[PDB]
Copies of this chain bind each other. A is one copy, B any other.
Amino acid sequence: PQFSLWKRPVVTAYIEGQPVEVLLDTGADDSIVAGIELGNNYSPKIVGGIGGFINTLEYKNVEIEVLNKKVRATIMTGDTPINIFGRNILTALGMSLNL
Binding site for B on A (CB under 8 A): 1-6, 8-9, 23-29, 32, 47-54, 67, 80-82, 84, 87, 90-91, 93-99
Q: Roughly how many angstroms separate A27 CA and B2 CA in the complex, as a whole number?
A: 15
Q: Is the CB of B24 within 8 A of A97?
A: yes
Would you give the shortest CB distance from A35 to chain B, in whole angstroms? 15
Taking CB as reference atom, which chain B residue is nearest A93? Answer: B99
Q: Is the CB of B2 within 8 A of A98?
A: yes
Q: Roughly how many angstroms separate A72 CA and B51 CA in the complex, as a whole number?
A: 27
Q: Is the CB of B97 within 8 A of A27?
A: no
B contact residues around A27 at 8 Å (CB) = 8-9, 23-28, 82, 84
